Every structure is written in C-alpha cells, then in structure tokens.
Design a protein around this motif. Structure first.
Motif, PDB file in Angstrom:
ATOM      1  N   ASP A  60      -1.005   8.253  -0.041  1.00 56.67           N
ATOM      2  CA  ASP A  60      -1.984   9.301  -1.060  1.00 56.67           C
ATOM      3  C   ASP A  60      -2.315  10.347  -0.142  1.00 56.67           C
ATOM      4  O   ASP A  60      -2.521  10.407   0.981  1.00 56.67           O
ATOM      5  CB  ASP A  60      -2.895   8.572  -1.695  1.00 56.67           C
ATOM      6  CG  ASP A  60      -4.325   8.208  -0.658  1.00 56.67           C
ATOM      7  OD1 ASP A  60      -4.826   9.088  -0.515  1.00 56.67           O
ATOM      8  OD2 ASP A  60      -4.546   7.026  -0.250  1.00 56.67           O
TER       9      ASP A  60
ATOM     10  N   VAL B  37       0.968  -1.114   0.129  1.00 58.36           N
ATOM     11  CA  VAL B  37       0.057   0.004  -0.001  1.00 58.36           C
ATOM     12  C   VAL B  37       0.792   1.235  -0.003  1.00 58.36           C
ATOM     13  O   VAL B  37       1.718   1.313   0.588  1.00 58.36           O
ATOM     14  CB  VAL B  37      -0.887   0.032   1.073  1.00 58.36           C
ATOM     15  CG1 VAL B  37      -1.619   1.158   1.355  1.00 58.36           C
ATOM     16  CG2 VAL B  37      -1.892  -1.095   1.031  1.00 58.36           C
ATOM     17  N   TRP B  38       0.427   2.302  -0.762  1.00 56.34           N
ATOM     18  CA  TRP B  38       1.125   3.528  -1.019  1.00 56.34           C
ATOM     19  C   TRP B  38       0.513   4.560  -0.256  1.00 56.34           C
ATOM     20  O   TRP B  38      -0.728   4.722  -0.396  1.00 56.34           O
ATOM     21  CB  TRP B  38       1.439   3.720  -2.715  1.00 56.34           C
ATOM     22  CG  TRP B  38       2.018   2.598  -3.146  1.00 56.34           C
ATOM     23  CD1 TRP B  38       1.528   1.606  -3.520  1.00 56.34           C
ATOM     24  CD2 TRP B  38       3.408   2.639  -3.577  1.00 56.34           C
ATOM     25  NE1 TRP B  38       2.478   0.515  -4.180  1.00 56.34           N
ATOM     26  CE2 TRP B  38       3.830   1.281  -3.918  1.00 56.34           C
ATOM     27  CE3 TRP B  38       4.474   3.411  -3.209  1.00 56.34           C
ATOM     28  CZ2 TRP B  38       5.042   1.100  -4.542  1.00 56.34           C
ATOM     29  CZ3 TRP B  38       5.812   3.168  -3.628  1.00 56.34           C
ATOM     30  CH2 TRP B  38       6.059   1.840  -4.219  1.00 56.34           C
TER      31      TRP B  38
ATOM     32  N   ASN C 177      -6.721   9.966   1.341  1.00 59.59           N
ATOM     33  CA  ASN C 177      -7.640   9.288   2.459  1.00 59.59           C
ATOM     34  C   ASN C 177      -7.148   9.769   3.871  1.00 59.59           C
ATOM     35  O   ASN C 177      -6.114  10.196   3.970  1.00 59.59           O
ATOM     36  CB  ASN C 177      -7.215   7.783   2.153  1.00 59.59           C
ATOM     37  CG  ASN C 177      -8.118   7.209   1.105  1.00 59.59           C
ATOM     38  OD1 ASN C 177      -9.237   7.356   1.158  1.00 59.59           O
ATOM     39  ND2 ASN C 177      -7.209   6.717   0.110  1.00 59.59           N
TER      40      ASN C 177
ATOM     41  N   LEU D  59      -7.654   2.709  -2.134  1.00 62.86           N
ATOM     42  CA  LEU D  59      -6.413   2.834  -1.467  1.00 62.86           C
ATOM     43  C   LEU D  59      -5.514   2.323  -2.759  1.00 62.86           C
ATOM     44  O   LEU D  59      -5.882   1.581  -3.476  1.00 62.86           O
ATOM     45  CB  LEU D  59      -6.119   2.008  -0.400  1.00 62.86           C
ATOM     46  CG  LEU D  59      -6.365   2.342   1.076  1.00 62.86           C
ATOM     47  CD1 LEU D  59      -7.744   3.035   1.223  1.00 62.86           C
ATOM     48  CD2 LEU D  59      -6.079   1.424   2.253  1.00 62.86           C
ATOM     49  N   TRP D  60      -4.392   2.938  -2.622  1.00 62.60           N
ATOM     50  CA  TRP D  60      -3.181   2.621  -3.990  1.00 62.60           C
ATOM     51  C   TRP D  60      -2.534   1.562  -3.429  1.00 62.60           C
ATOM     52  O   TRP D  60      -1.634   1.568  -2.211  1.00 62.60           O
ATOM     53  CB  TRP D  60      -2.317   3.921  -3.757  1.00 62.60           C
ATOM     54  CG  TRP D  60      -3.039   5.272  -4.513  1.00 62.60           C
ATOM     55  CD1 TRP D  60      -4.380   5.191  -4.738  1.00 62.60           C
ATOM     56  CD2 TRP D  60      -2.190   6.397  -4.394  1.00 62.60           C
ATOM     57  NE1 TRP D  60      -4.317   6.679  -5.050  1.00 62.60           N
ATOM     58  CE2 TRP D  60      -3.121   7.399  -4.941  1.00 62.60           C
ATOM     59  CE3 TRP D  60      -0.907   6.891  -4.324  1.00 62.60           C
ATOM     60  CZ2 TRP D  60      -2.830   8.797  -5.285  1.00 62.60           C
ATOM     61  CZ3 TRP D  60      -0.711   8.036  -4.467  1.00 62.60           C
ATOM     62  CH2 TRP D  60      -1.561   8.955  -5.079  1.00 62.60           C
TER      63      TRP D  60
HETATM   64 MG   LIG Z   1      -3.596   4.663  -0.345  1.00 66.68          MG
END
Ligand SMILES: [Mg+2]
Ligand SMILES: [Mg+2]
Ligand code: NI
Length: 78
Positions: A12, A9-10, A15, A70-71
């Motif tokens: 961002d 997960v990255w 969020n 989510l990324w």
């Molecule tokens: Mg994310």
C-alpha cells in the motif's frame, strides 16, 4: 474436503516499511529477520503470504492486520 488457508498482506502507498516489520513481530511473534523478509517480499512482489492455518485462525490474523492499518486478505491454500 478439508483445506488450510493463508493470510496475504498487500503493498500500500501509505504505511512505513519499518512499521510493517514491527507489526509482523508484534502480531505474530516473528523474529526480526523473518518479519523484515516478509515485509520486503510484499514490498517487492506486491503481496506475500504472512501466516497459514485454519480458515478460522486466518480470519483472526486478517482482523489483527486490518486494525494495525495493513491491507490483508485470506484465501484457501491450493
Ligand atoms: Mg498493507
Ligand atoms: Mg499455496
Ligand atoms: Ni512502497
């Protein structure tokens, strides 16, 4: 050769931190201290491995995370 995979997960800019903690509990069954730790690892390091397993299993986790907003990506573990 055979290899396991991880879902990453990255961070961002949109969020909420509290949302991410909830998403990790909801999608993966993680406890609150585990989910919060992973959330803070992503937020402070930019990324973090959130789950691990076969390529097929990580594909499901990426899709679940994307639907949550989510990324997420996946890559082979080395
Ligand atoms: Mg994310
Ligand atoms: Mg690794
Ligand atoms: Ni932030």
């Amino acid at each position: 050769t055979e290899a396991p995979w991880v879902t990453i997960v990255w961070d961002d800019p949109v969020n909420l931190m509290s949302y991410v903690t909830y998403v990790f509990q909801k999608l993966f069954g993680y406890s609150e201290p585990h989910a919060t730790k992973l959330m803070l690892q992503v937020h402070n390091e930019g990324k973090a491995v959130v789950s691990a397993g076969s390529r097929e299993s990580m594909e499901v986790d990426v899709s679940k995370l994307h639907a949550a907003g989510l990324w997420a990506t996946m890559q082979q573990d080395r």
